[PDB]
Write a protein that binds this ligand. Structure first.
Ligand SMILES: Nc1ncnc2c1ncn2[C@@H]1O[C@H](COP(=O)(O)OP(=O)(O)OP(O)(O)=S)[C@@H](O)[C@H]1O
Ligand SMILES: [Mg+2]
Lengths: 333, 56
DNA sequence: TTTTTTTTTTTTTTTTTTTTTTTTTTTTTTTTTTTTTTTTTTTTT
DNA sequence: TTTTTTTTTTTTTTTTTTTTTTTTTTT
C-alpha cells in the first residue's frame, strides 16, 4: 500500500530530472550500456594479461611514469600503432619537443594520419586536449611529459622566480574539466610523467612524480616502467629488458607485473613473449636451454626459439590462440 | 540573507528588551578572498548582527 | 439640515549616470602520516 | 418662480559572498 505511493513519487522525480537535464540524465545502472568498460591493446601480450581486462580502458585517463630511457615514449607509440591498425584516429601532444617521426614509422605508426602538436605553454597543451575530446573524432591522445607542461606565468617570468603550486593548480583544473568530456567522446587520454626525488624523508620511498596530486586520483590505470637489463648479440647491445608494474588499477586487480624486450628499431618483441607464455602454460616444453613444441625441437636459446616462431606462422597463430583462451580473464572475440 | 538579517535586527531589538528575553545567535566562520591586511576570517549573514549584539 | 448606492482602465514610458577614489588596525594550529625504495651491474689508464 | 459648475498633484533605497595548490638532492 505505502510501496505504491513511493514508486509513483520516484517515477515523477525521475521524469522531472530527465525533462530538466535530458534523456540519459538518470537511469538504472544495469540498463546503462555507456557505463560498460571497453579496452584496446598495449602491443605487449604480457601487459594485456597484467591489466586483467585485456588492455587500456577507453573514456578514461592513464599515467605512465619511470626513470630516464625506461621506454615510456616507445610504449605509447606501440599503443597508437595497434589502435591505427583497428581504424582509430590518434593525436600526439609533444611538450618535450623530442619526438622523431622516422623512429615512429619504424615502430609501425601511420605518420601521415597521426595528428601532432608542439605547444608553447602548459595551458595551450591542455586546451588542445579538451578541444579534441569534445570533437568526438579522436580515439587516443598522448601527452609526452606532464613535467614539460609549463604554466604561462612561469614562461613570461625569469629563471629563479618562485611559482609554488602553480603547475599543481593547473593540473587540478584540467582533470575536473577533461574527465566528463573524455567519457562522453569515449576517448583514451595517456599522460607520460617523469620521476623526481622528495628531500628530507627516510620512511617510505623518496621517489615522486611531477604535476601535483590530482592525476593520482583521476587516473584509472597507473604504470611504473623500468629498464632491468641489456639484450646482446655477443658484444653488440641490440635492445633493453623491461619490467612494467601495475601500481593502480580500477578495472581489475592491481599489483601484477609484465616482463618483455624492447629491440631498437623494431619495438616490443611479440614472439619473445609468446615463448615465455607458451612455457608457462605447458604448451612449449623446455629441457635446460632447449625448447620443444609437441615432441619436435624448435631451437636452442630464446633467440633461436623466437626465430623458429617467425618462419612458422601456423604454430605461432596456434599458440597465440590457446594462450589468449587460457590466461585472458575476459576475452573479446 | 544580509538584508533579511538587517530587517530582523530592527524588528526584534525592541521586543526582546520589553519581554526581558535573551536571544543567542550561533554563527560559523568563512574565509574572505582578496585580503592582505588583518584576519581573512569572516562570519556569515551580513553586518547588522555585529552592531546589534551586546556580547560577541 | 443632501443623498449616492455605483467607477473606470484599455494600455506608459527611457532617450542613457555617476564615481570623484577602500577599507585595515593585526590571526591562526592545537599536532600529521609512513605502509614500505631501488639497482641492472663501473672504472684503471 | 428659476437653475449649475468644474479637477489637482508624486514619493523614496536596500544588501555581500567565497579559497587554491607543491617543489627538489648532497658527498
Ligand atoms: N630513434 C631511435 N633509434 C634507436 N633507438 C631509440 C630511438 N629512440 C629511442 N631509442 C631507444 O629506445 C629505448 C627507450 O627509449 P624511449 O622510448 O625514448 O624511453 P623514454 O622513457 O621515453 O626516454 P626519455 O624521453 O628520453 S626520459 C632507449 O634505449 C633508446 O635509446
Ligand atoms: Mg620520452
Amino acid at each position: 500500500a505505502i510501496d505504491e505511493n513511493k514508486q509513483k513519487a520516484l517515477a515523477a522525480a525521475l521524469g522531472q530530472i530527465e525533462k530538466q537535464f535530458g534523456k540519459g540524465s538518470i537511469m538504472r545502472l544495469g540498463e546503462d550500456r555507456s557505463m560498460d568498460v571497453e579496452t584496446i591493446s598495449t602491443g605487449s601480450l604480457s601487459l594485456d594479461i597484467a591489466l586483467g581486462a585485456g588492455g587500456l580502458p577507453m573514456g578514461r585517463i592513464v599515467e605512465i611514469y619511470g626513470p630516464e630511457s625506461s621506454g615510456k615514449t616507445t610504449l605509447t607509440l606501440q599503443v597508437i600503432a595497434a589502435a591505427q591498425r583497428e581504424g582509430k584516429t590518434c593525436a600526439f601532444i609533444d611538450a618535450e619537443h623530442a619526438l622523431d617521426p622516422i623512429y615512429a614509422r619504424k615502430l609501425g605508426v601511420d605518420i601521415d594520419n597521426l595528428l601532432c602538436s608542439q605547444p608553447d605553454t602548459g595551458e595551450q597543451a591542455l586546451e588542445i586536449c579538451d578541444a579534441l575530446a569534445r570533437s568526438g573524432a579522436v580515439d587516443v591522445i598522448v601527452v609526452d611529459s606532464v613535467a614539460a607542461l609549463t604554466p604561462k606565468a612561469e614562461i613570461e617570468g625569469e629563471i629563479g622566480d618562485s611559482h609554488m603550486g602553480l603547475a599543481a593548480r593547473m593540473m587540478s583544473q584540467a582533470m575536473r574539466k577533461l574527465a566528463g568530456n573524455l567519457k562522453q567522446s569515449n576517448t583514451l587520454l595517456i599522460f607520460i610523467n617523469q620521476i623526481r626525488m622528495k628531500i628530507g624523508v627516510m620512511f617510505g620511498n623518496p621517489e615522486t612524480t611531477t604535476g601535483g596530486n590530482a592525476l593520482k586520483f583521476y587516473a584509472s590505470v597507473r604504470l611504473d616502467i623500468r629498464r632491468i637489463g641489456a639484450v646482446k648479440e655477443g658484444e653488440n647491445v641490440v635492445g633493453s629488458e623491461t619490467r612494467v608494474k601495475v601500481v593502480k588499477n580500477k578495472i581489475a586487480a592491481p599489483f601484477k607485473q609484465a616482463e618483455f624486450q624492447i629491440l631498437y628499431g623494431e619495438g616490443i618483441n611479440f614472439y619473445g613473449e609468446l615463448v615465455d607464455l607458451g612455457v608457462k602454460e605447458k604448451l612449449i616444453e623446455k629441457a635446460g636451454a632447449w625448447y620443444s613444441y609437441k615432441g619436435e625441437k624448435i631451437g636452442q636459446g630464446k633467440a633461436n626459439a623466437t626465430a623458429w616462431l617467425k618462419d612458422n606462422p601456423e604454430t605461432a597463430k596456434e599458440i597465440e590462440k590457446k594462450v589468449r583462451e587460457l590466461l585472458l580473464s575476459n576475452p573479446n572475440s
